[PDB]
């Protein structure tokens, strides 16, 4: 089925020398290697960007195409041959950030030989001295910072690695990718545009025999998914959801993208939430928001107290009890107008208590209960 393979291509786990819409940055990164393996100079590279911009994908693309365990060959612009050792490491999937040197050593040394125990800068620096280029690609380099400690000790491991990829008599070239005179070179990966997203999609589905999307649908999906600070993962889920929505009802039209963008956005719509309420529930909602206006940190009991005094000032709609007041508050929380949380007081008696809060816009509230036009003074 064409639908199954098209759905397979638009997953977040699908791969594809240069990626589409990234080739210049590719050349920039390749230019780094075009010096580093050439002159046997240790150097360090920093890569930033918002998520889904193709950093990990382009680096894995480079490693899979154009490259003692994990030894291979690389060609320079003149391109004779060069022995390189290339690995990739995700820093979050390690136990502690201090063990990464050892991890690099367990990524390089042959298993038949003596497995040494490694702590820090010095043992790795002594190990790479008799050698062959070592390419390390470190995904998420920022979680190498210690979230505790201070500014002096959080940047211990990263500064140690930057110093160990900068000094002579080693051949250590370091690529690090984080999310957005020996300081690293920086390429900022940029968020994709609609045309770039379009070209990526047709390049990915060029392996398919037919295209079961209208091109206007892909262009509309790309222009809605790009915006500012866009991620290609969002475009992939939009197209995949379009396929799933299409085959749950039966080429994919322009309308199915809009059906996706109506199914998976909440569409808050405070007026239609309010229109589903009763007149009593609207009265309790008005007293609650008035209590939050004049007390600004109010528990449920003080809100009920204000409701009792405010509707005995009116002497219509005879009052109810505290537990059913909490019940209508639960109805209001189910509708999506009221949030009840459990917090601490700021008084002399600091204890836990249930606090009430709102997440609704004031203009729609005031308009929709001035359209009621009978029970005024609670607004």
């Amino acid at each position: 089925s064409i639908f199954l393979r098209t759905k397979a291509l638009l997953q977040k786990s699908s791969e594809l020398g240069a990626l589409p819409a990234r080739t210049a940055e590719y050349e920039q990164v390749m230019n780094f290697l075009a010096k580093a393996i050439s002159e046997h100079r240790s150097d360090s590279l920093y890569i930033t960007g918002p998520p889904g911009t193709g950093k990990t994908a382009q680096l894995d693309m480079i490693i899979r195409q154009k490259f003692l365990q994990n030894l291979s060959w690389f060609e320079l612009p003149d391109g004779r041959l060069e022995s390189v050792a290339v690995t990739s490491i995700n820093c979050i999937s390690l136990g502690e950030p201090s063990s990464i040197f050892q991890k690099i050593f367990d990524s390089f040394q042959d298993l038949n030989g003596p497995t040494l125990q490694i702590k820090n800068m010095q043992h790795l620096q002594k190990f790479l001295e008799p050698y062959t280029t070592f390419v390390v690609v470190l995904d998420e380099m920022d979680r190498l910072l210690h979230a505790n400690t201070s500014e002096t000790q959080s940047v211990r491991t990263i500064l140690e690695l930057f110093l160990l990829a900068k000094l002579p008599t080693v051949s250590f070239v370091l690529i690090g990718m984080a999310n957005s005179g020996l300081l690293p070179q920086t390429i900022v990966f940029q968020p994709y545009t609609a045309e770039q997203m379009y070209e990526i999609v047709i390049q990915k589905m060029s392996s398919l025999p037919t295209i079961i999307f209208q091109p206007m649908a892909i262009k509309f999906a790309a222009k809605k998914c790009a915006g500012n600070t866009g991620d290609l993962r969002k475009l992939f889920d939009v197209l995949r959801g379009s396929i799933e929505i299409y085959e749950l009802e039966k080429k994919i039209g322009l309308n199915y993208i809009a059906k996706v963008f109506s199914k998976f956005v909440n569409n808050n719509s405070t007026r239609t939430r309010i229109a589903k309420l009763n007149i009593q529930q609207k009265l309790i909602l008005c007293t609650i928001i008035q209590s939050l206006k004049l007390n600004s940190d109010a528990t449920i009991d003080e809100s009920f107290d204000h409701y009792i005094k405010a509707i005995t000032k009116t002497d219509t709609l005879a009052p109810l009890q505290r537990n059913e007041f909490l019940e209508i508050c639960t109805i209001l929380e189910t509708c999506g107008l009221v949030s009840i949380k459990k917090t601490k007081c700021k008084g002399k008696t600091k204890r836990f208590v249930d606090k009430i809060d709102v997440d609704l816009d004031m203009r729609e509230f005031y308009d929709e209960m001035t359209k009621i036009s009978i029970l005024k003074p609670f607004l």
Binding site: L4, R5, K7, A8, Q11, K12, S13, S14, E15, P50, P51, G52, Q69, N90, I92, S93, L94, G95, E96, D106, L111, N112, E140, R143, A147, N179, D231, R233, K234, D237, V238, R240, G241, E244, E247, L248, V260, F264, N266, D301, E302, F304, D305, I308, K309, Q321, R322, N323, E324, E327, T330, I331, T334, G347, K348, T349, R351, V353
Partner: protein, 483 residues
């Protein structure tokens, strides 16, 4: 050697430390893990068993209560979406994340388990390849990293510590080729409970779904649709994705259908009831059982107004059946060892005890000293409006209320008891009798809040309950409302 302290109750598991990346010499040295006798799942039940020496009398309402227990008529579109995503990702050997969120009791776990059951049935028919189903509940973990210990133990059969398990799972999902693998479907239930400060577990579980060789289906069940936006980073929100499946609370018609589906074979049916004991047999008197459609409708409308929670609707119906069965067993005197109807009265009484408040009737049944305390506290809130009153001011105002209404009959009989405990040999006391007792009683009840202070006079006291229900309980009393 002489220790500075001792740790004499250390209980350490038999968990190894070496990760899976050092289990074979090369990537090519890894065998086909499906043809391994410990991978992918290739004793306490009898201790809670005994011999029964009697014959339990199951009355006619016992089958109704048994069928109303928590142990898919309203979830078609959610079932179809989850099943289609999982079927597509399993049959094409890809990795994906499905996100499900909703309020309690809206059928999230039941729908996901039904989807997994149907996928296992389809994999037993050789229509999709085999997969391993793992269920990780974040509220059933002692430590949040134990999920790393659980999942890897479900995959390999080994028992490692959590960091080695995490490296093992990373190496497995990233480096092991798809021809040597089986697909894994992981249900991450109570997803908010596995959220930690560093969010490494969430990143790892949702980042393994982005690897090309992973063959991993992560179904994450949450409580809010905005959990990645509120609590998680941008990196994990990007990996979870834009498509999210919302489980709305049930409307009253679907709750009505759920309750009728639990009672399809019992409602409007006849039983042979033995009048000697009470034991009823489903097809000696022939008794028809009936539960009203109006009763089920009003319970379903109430529950759909509150939450749309199927647990609450089933529990309300079970409570109504329990109330009716208690009245029936009381009127016949049966024990435990022509038409029986569970009516809308029992349903309303089940709905009322959950909505009844005991705070007012607790305060109306207190002693005179506790009521006098609450009355003086409310008097001080009326005098100065501070909402926190010092205990010494309460002492002085109780003394003032005693000496001002001194000509009252009840007060002039109560004063000797309050200040001397009815004894001439006892000196006049600065606190009333049972002052500490009623203070601590109102603190344990949660009616009162007291600050942590060591000077008894300037220590402040606050109402924790609402003021008007305290005033209602005070006006219920005969003596206090007359002075």
């Amino acid at each position: 050697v002489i220790r500075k302290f001792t740790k004499k109750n250390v209980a350490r598991a038999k968990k190894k430390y070496t990760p899976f990346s050092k289990r074979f010499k090369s990537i090519a040295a890894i065998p086909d893990l499906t043809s391994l006798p410990e991978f992918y799942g290739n004793r306490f039940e009898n201790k809670l068993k005994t011999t029964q020496k009697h014959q339990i009398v199951e009355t006619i309402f016992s089958k109704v209560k048994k069928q109303l227990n928590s142990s898919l008529p309203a979830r078609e579109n959610e079932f179809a979406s989850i099943y289609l995503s999982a079927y597509s990702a399993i049959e094409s050997d890809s990795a994906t994340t499905i996100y499900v969120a909703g309020t309690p009791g809206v059928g999230k776990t039941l729908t996901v388990r039904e989807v997994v059951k149907e996928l296992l049935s389809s994999s037993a028919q050789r229509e999709i390849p085999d997969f391993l189903y793992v269920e990780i509940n974040g509220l059933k973990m002692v430590k949040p990293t134990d999920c790393y210990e659980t999942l890897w133990n479900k995959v390999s059969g080994e028992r490692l510590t959590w960091a080695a398990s995490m490296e093992s799972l990373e190496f497995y999902f990233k480096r092991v080729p798809k021809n040597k693998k089986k697909t894994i479907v992981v249900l991450l239930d109570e997803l908010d409970a596995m959220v930690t400060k560093s969010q490494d577990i969430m990143y790892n579980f949702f980042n393994w779904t982005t690897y090309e060789n992973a063959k991993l289906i992560v179904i994450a069940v949450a409580n809010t649709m905005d959990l990645p936006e509120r609590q998680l980073g941008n990196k994990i929100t990007s990996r979870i994705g834009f498509t999210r499946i919302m489980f709305t609370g049930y409307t009253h018609e679907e709750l009505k259908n759920i309750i009728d589906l639990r009672l399809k074979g019992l409602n409007d049916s006849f039983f042979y009831v033995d009048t000697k004991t009470g034991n009823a047999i489903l097809i000696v008197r022939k008794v028809r059982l009936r539960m009203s459609a109006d009763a089920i409708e009003i319970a379903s409308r109430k529950v759909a107004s509150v939450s749309g929670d199927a647990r609450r609707a089933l529990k309300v119906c079970k409570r109504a059946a329990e109330i009716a069965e208690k009245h029936y067993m009381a009127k016949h005197g049966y024990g435990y060892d022509g038409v029986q109807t569970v009516h809308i009265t029992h349903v309303m009484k089940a709905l009322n005890e959950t909505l009844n408040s005991h705070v007012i009737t607790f305060m109306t049944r207190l002693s005179f000293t506790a009521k006098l305390f609450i009355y003086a506290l409310l008097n001080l809130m009326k005098k100065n409006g501070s909402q926190e009153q010092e205990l010494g001011d309460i002492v002085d105002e109780i003394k003032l209320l005693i000496e001002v209404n001194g000509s009252n009959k009840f007060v002039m009989e109560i004063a000797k008891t309050l200040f001397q405990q009815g004894s001439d040999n006892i000196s006049e006391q600065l606190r009333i009798i049972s002052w500490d007792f009623v203070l601590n009683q109102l603190l344990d009840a949660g009616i009162l809040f007291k600050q942590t202070m060591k000077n008894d006079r300037i220590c402040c006291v606050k109402l924790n309950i609402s003021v008007e229900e305290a005033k209602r309980a005070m006006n219920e009393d005969e003596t206090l409302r007359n002075l």
